[PDB]
UniProtKB/Swiss-Prot annotation, chain D:
Expression sites by tissue: Widely expressed.
Complete-protein stretch covered: 2281 to 2318 of 2335
Effect the entry attributes to changing F34L: In RP13; reduces interaction with EFTUD2, but not with SNRNP200
Pathological association: Retinitis pigmentosa 13: A retinal dystrophy belonging to the group of pigmentary retinopathies. Retinitis pigmentosa is characterized by retinal pigment deposits visible on fundus examination and primary loss of rod photoreceptor cells followed by secondary loss of cone photoreceptors. Patients typically have night vision blindness and loss of midperipheral visual field. As their condition progresses, they lose their far peripheral visual field and eventually central vision as well.
Subcellular location: Nucleus; Nucleus speckle
Subunit and partners: Part of the U5 snRNP complex. Component of the U4/U6-U5 tri-snRNP complex composed of the U4, U6 and U5 snRNAs and at least PRPF3, PRPF4, PRPF6, PRPF8, PRPF31, SNRNP200, TXNL4A, SNRNP40, DDX23, CD2BP2, PPIH, SNU13, EFTUD2, SART1 and USP39. Component of the U5.U4atac/U6atac snRNP complexes in U12-dependent spliceosomes. Within the minor spliceosome, which acts on U12-type introns, interacts with PPIL2 and RBM48. Core component of U2-type precatalytic, catalytic and postcatalytic spliceosomal complexes. Found in a mRNA splicing-dependent exon junction complex (EJC) with SRRM1.
Name the UniProt record assigns to this protein: Pre-mRNA-processing-splicing factor 8
Protein source organism: Homo sapiens
From Swiss-Prot, chain F:
Subunit structure: Component of the spliceosome B complex. Interacts (via N-terminal interaction domain) with ZMAT2 and MFAP1.
Region described as N-terminal protein interaction domain: spans on this chain: 1-176
Lineage: Eukaryota, Metazoa, Chordata, Craniata, Vertebrata
Designated name of the protein: Pre-mRNA-splicing factor 38A
Keywords for this protein: Coiled coil, mRNA processing, mRNA splicing, Nucleus, Phosphoprotein, Spliceosome
Source organism of this protein record: Homo sapiens (Human)
Source species, domain of life: Eukaryota
Residues shown, of full length: 1 to 176 of 312
Function: Involved in pre-mRNA splicing as a component of the spliceosome.
Swiss-Prot record, chain G:
Name of protein: Zinc finger matrin-type protein 2
Top-level taxon in the UniProt lineage: Eukaryota
Subunit field text: Component of the spliceosome B complex.
Subcellular location: Nucleus
Protein task: Involved in pre-mRNA splicing as a component of the spliceosome.
Species this chain originates from: Homo sapiens (Human)
Cross-link Glycyl lysine isopeptide (Lys-Gly) (interchain with G-Cter in SUMO2) placement: K24, K45
Lineage, opening ranks: Eukaryota, Metazoa, Chordata, Craniata, Vertebrata
Stretches annotated zinc finger (Matrin-type): 2-26
UniProtKB/Swiss-Prot annotation, chain H:
Highest taxon above the source species: Eukaryota
Assigned protein family: Belongs to the MFAP1 family.
Coiled coil: none
Gene giving rise to this polypeptide: MFAP1
Protein name: Microfibrillar-associated protein 1
Cross-link (Glycyl lysine isopeptide (Lys-Gly) (interchain with G-Cter in SUMO2)): K87, K101, K111
Function noted in UniProt: Involved in pre-mRNA splicing as a component of the spliceosome.
Subcellular localization, as worded in the UniProt entry: Nucleus
Subunit details: Component of the spliceosome B complex. Interacts with PRPF38A (via N-terminal interaction domain).
PTM-bearing positions, type Phosphoserine: S91
Length: 56, 55, 111, 38, 73, 176, 56, 123, 241
RNA sequence: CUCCGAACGGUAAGAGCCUAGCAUGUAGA
């Protein structure tokens, strides 16, 4: 219920996703497709616990 | 069309137009406004479905 | 003549500048050839400014030739400003030209 | 029907009769070999 | 409609939205409207594979955001 | 070889003599089998034999733009730059329609507008048909009169740019 | 591929062999690249006469 | 087809003569149309004579950007040919406009470390 | 079950390698060819180490000879002539433009060529020219998450390379069998022949299973992703009875 | 509701052979 805290975590989760992307490539993808970031661990993905809206 | 001065080097690889254009007050006002009135009433008259080419 | 002299003066026979002030590659070859090509923000900016210039001048040329009248030079100067936004010489050169373009589009909206 | 494999189907129905069958290399058994004439 | 980008190796990058059943011919006509050259003088490829004009987009499987090669014959 | 065929003979109207067509079309025509066979050796009678050999009208075809033999003969004639008498004899020869079309294209390309009109005025009376190649490479049927009227009109043909001087009324008011 | 017996070199393409023909030291012994036009009239006259004679 | 060939040649020559005469008469007709428009604006009818419509080459089919649909311009480089590919009503979501952009937390213009612009077109 | 970044890279390389996900793409890597849209540097070195040697060219050759041997199992019944395994360029499968077909089919006498058709539909149309030849042209293509429709890609590539000049080909007909090694699919869609659809259907089945090239590829991928479950001349050894 | 972005960070690494568009304008005897 603290809206500034809700907004800070959203941009930071996108920031960590950006750091993973700029690690994966070097040229800052136009749209890193959201599956291989936000998908679950045991089925061979990165398992971000994403506390922010992002449409697939 | 009128004309202009021109300053050409003998190399002729450049030609600046030397006449720093020097119109008058109400003269240029009434000129471009005359074009405004004739332009609007020109659109009033013709059905002129035309423009220039892109290139 | 000026920019084509610069282009052929850099020992690069791969590109042929359009006389309507474009630039297009010829052989569909780049990578190594592109790596001595894709450069010179000054050349792209100067080609842009001359492109807007030559669009204006050739517009008045075909005006005083064959379809000048009153429609062509007026509408062409107007869409030449709106196309200084949309067609030619875009923001790839310098920063603030988007601000002058947006002021141009707004002035067009008023008029 | 070895020389004409396109007319053979597993779901095709056919009747039988009491007569002697022709050879494999017979002219009635191979219409494609006799029709190759330009 | 799908948006494509036709960036070149000389600062020539254009963005055009076109529909799905549309062919490469009308798409080259729309690029010609965009970047100020003739439509028959546009050759757009995928690194040595030249996209022929008559075949539609869904056969080449071009999707929204994909980059082409813009060249001139 | 491919640079220039004449050391110092003449010049073009407003460009280089070897650069009358576009540079992309010149680079595409610089690599071909018939173009290499012509650049290995080319004379006036050899150009006449090459014009009498092939009867086709067209430019580049397909995605991989390859030049037509008529375009290769036109490029070799523009590079070699023959005299006006040989071009007038090729335009006046009605035996070979392809050689007459090549001479008409050479006279409309490098010639003056008055000479182009004086050479295209007998060209409008030729009702003989000729083979034409489309942009996709398919063969198309056309006539010599339609190609002469297209060459006497504004430049809309592929790999060709030859503007006129004025209208017919303005040219008639200026001279004959 | 292509073979040049004058230079005894192996050309991998046709343009390499056609180039090795003339435009090289072999051409320098063959008269280099110099070729002129043949007259004006007589070449076109005899060419049109021979072409019309061989045609019909 | 010598007779048909001569007939077609005569047809083409007649068409060319008609085209030249039509260019001359088209200059004359531009003059006459200017004169007729002037006379009509003078004494045709006070808001009682239109005799025309709103003839425009390219269709003006438009829509409405949902919340932040980009100003996708069609490009003013070819507008007189009146081709069918142009009239297609570009008011659709291209890549990112498919979303609603209303349920989002506060606002998301562009998350690419480049929001130098600061506006929403409200003031 | 620098190392683990590479495993993530390959196990999602089919979604992390695409023009849509990197806008300005043009590269063909090497050997067969990979749409490496970027640097994607770890994925690049790994995919070269995945396609270890001349393995792709061998895959094309093994698929071609297997299709020929499957045809050599009904050639007489299909009224062919003989094995028309054509000659090709040395590195010929490493290109993306042309298709000079490996397996022509010199028919015995006047086969009847059908229309353009896909190898899934049944409403064939055998009402056309009486072709002396249909050609079999292989094409292999590493797909993506937005290139994974081999059938549409195949109909496109066949009608394109047929229509354009661009290329030599066989006579009048080249039925282009094409299998996408990424999503293991099978496709051919153009001028089908007289009655060859059942042949090519069972052929694509018998080729996709068990062909030693495809097995070597699947095993190389599994062990990389680490996720387990003239008689005097040499090389001419024969027998003399 | 109409604020439209451009480039670098990106294509390897070389082996033997083959072909090209250019540039200077000299004192000397």
């Amino acid at each position: 219920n603290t809206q500034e805290l809700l907004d800070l975590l959203v941009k930071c989760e996108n920031k960590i996703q950006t750091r993973i992307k700029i690690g994966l490539n070097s040229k800052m993808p136009s749209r890193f497709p959201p599956v291989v970031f936000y998908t679950p661990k045991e089925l061979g993905g990165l398992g971000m616990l994403s506390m922010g809206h992002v449409l697939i | 069309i009128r004309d202009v001065p021109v300053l050409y080097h003998i190399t002729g690889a450049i030609s600046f137009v030397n006449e720093i254009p020097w119109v008058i007050e109400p003269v240029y006002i009434s000129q471009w406004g005359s074009m405004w009135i004739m332009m609007r009433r020109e659109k009033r008259d013709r059905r002129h479905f035309k423009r220039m080419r892109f290139p | 003549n000026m920019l084509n002299l610069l282009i052929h003066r850099k020992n690069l026979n791969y590109l042929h500048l359009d006389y309507n002030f474009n630039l297009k590659p010829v052989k569909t070859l780049t990578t190594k050839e592109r790596k001595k090509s894709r450069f010179g923000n000054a050349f792209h900016l100067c080609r842009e400014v001359l492109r807007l210039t030559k669009l204006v001048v050739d517009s008045h040329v075909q005006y005083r030739l064959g379809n000048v009248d009153a429609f062509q030079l007026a509408d062409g100067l107007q869409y030449i400003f709106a196309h200084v936004g949309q067609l030619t010489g875009m923001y790839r050169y310098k920063y603030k030209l988007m601000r002058q373009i947006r002021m141009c589009k707004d002035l067009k909206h008023l008029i | 029907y070895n020389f004409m494999g396109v007319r053979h189907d597993p779901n095709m129905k056919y009747e039988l009769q009491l007569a002697n069958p022709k050879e494999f290399y017979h002219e009635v058994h191979r219409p494609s070999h006799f029709l190759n004439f330009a | 409609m799908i948006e494509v980008v036709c960036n070149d190796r000389l600062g020539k990058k254009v963005r055009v939205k076109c529909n799905t059943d549309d062919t490469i011919g009308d798409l080259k006509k729309l690029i010609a409207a965009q970047t100020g050259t003739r439509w028959n003088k546009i050759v757009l490829k995928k690194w040595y594979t030249i996209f022929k004009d008559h075949v539609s987009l869904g056969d080449y499987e071009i999707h929204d955001g994909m980059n082409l090669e813009l060249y001139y014959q | 070889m491919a640079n220039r065929t004449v050391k110092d003979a003449h010049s073009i109207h407003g460009t280089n003599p070897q650069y009358l067509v576009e540079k992309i079309i010149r680079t595409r025509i610089y690599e071909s089998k018939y173009w290499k066979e012509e650049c290995f050796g080319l004379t006036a009678e050899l150009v006449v034999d090459k014009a009498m050999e092939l009867r086709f009208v067209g430019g580049v075809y397909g995605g991989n733009i390859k030049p037509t033999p008529f375009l290769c003969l036109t490029l070799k004639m523009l590079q070699i730059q023959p005299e006006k008498d040989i071009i007038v004899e090729f335009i006046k020869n009605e035996d070979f329609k392809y050689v007459r079309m090549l001479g008409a294209l050479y006279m409309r390309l490098t010639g003056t507008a008055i000479d182009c009109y004086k050479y295209l005025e007998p060209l409008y009376n030729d009702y003989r048909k000729i083979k034409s190649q489309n942009r996709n490479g398919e063969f198309e049927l056309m006539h010599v009169d339609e190609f002469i009227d297209e060459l006497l009109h504004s430049e809309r043909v592929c790999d060709i740019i030859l503007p006129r001087l004025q209208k017919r009324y303005v040219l008639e008011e200026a001279e004959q | 591929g292509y073979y040049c017996n004058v230079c005894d070199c192996v050309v991998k393409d046709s343009i390499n062999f056609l180039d090795h023909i003339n435009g090289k030291k072999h051409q320098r012994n063959l008269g280099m690249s110099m070729r002129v036009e043949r007259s004006t009239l007589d070449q076109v006259k005899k060419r049109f006469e021979v072409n019309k004679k061989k045609m019909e | 087809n010598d007779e048909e060939e001569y007939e077609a040649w005569k047809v083409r020559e007649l068409k060319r003569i008609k085209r030249d005469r039509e260019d001359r008469e088209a200059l004359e007709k531009e003059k006459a149309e200017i004169e007729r428009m002037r006379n009509l604006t003078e004494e045709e009818r006070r808001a009682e004579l239109r005799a025309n419509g709103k003839v425009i080459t390219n269709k003006a089919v438009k829509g409405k950007y949902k919340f932040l649909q980009k100003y996708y311009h069609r490009g003013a480089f070819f507008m007189d040919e009146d081709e069918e590919v142009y009239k297609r009503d570009f008011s659709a979501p291209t890549l990112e406009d498919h979303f609603n952009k209303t349920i989002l937390p506060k606002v998301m213009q562009v998350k690419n470390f480049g929001r130098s612009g600061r506006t929403k077109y409200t003031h | 079950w620098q190392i683990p970044n590479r495993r993530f890279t390959l196990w999602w390389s089919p979604t992390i390698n695409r023009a849509n996900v990197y806008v300005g793409f043009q590269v063909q890597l090497d050997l067969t060819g990979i749409f490496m849209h970027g640097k994607i540097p770890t994925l690049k070195i790994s995919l070269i180490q995945i396609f270890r040697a001349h393995l792709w060219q061998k895959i094309h050759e093994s698929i071609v000879m297997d299709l020929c041997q499957v045809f050599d199992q009904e050639l007489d019944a299909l009224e062919i002539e003989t094995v028309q395994k054509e000659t090709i360029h040395p590195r010929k499968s490493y290109k993306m433009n042309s298709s000079c077909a490996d397996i022509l089919l010199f028919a015995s006498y006047k086969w009847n060529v059908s229309r353009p058709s896909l190898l899934a539909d049944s409403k064939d149309v055998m009402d056309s020219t009486t072709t002396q030849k249909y050609w079999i042209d292989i094409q292999l293509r590493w797909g993506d998450y937005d290139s994974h429709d081999i059938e549409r890609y195949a109909r496109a590539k066949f009608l394109d390379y047929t229509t354009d000049n661009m290329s030599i080909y066989p006579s009048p007909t080249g039925v282009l069998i094409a299998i996408d090694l990424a999503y293991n699919l099978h496709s051919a869609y153009g001028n089908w022949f007289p009655g060859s659809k059942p042949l090519i259907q069972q052929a694509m089945a018998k080729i996709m299973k068990a062909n030693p090239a495809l097995y070597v590829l699947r095993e190389r991928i599994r062990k990389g992703l680490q996720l387990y479950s003239g008689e005097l001349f040499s090389n001419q050894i024969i027998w003399f009875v």
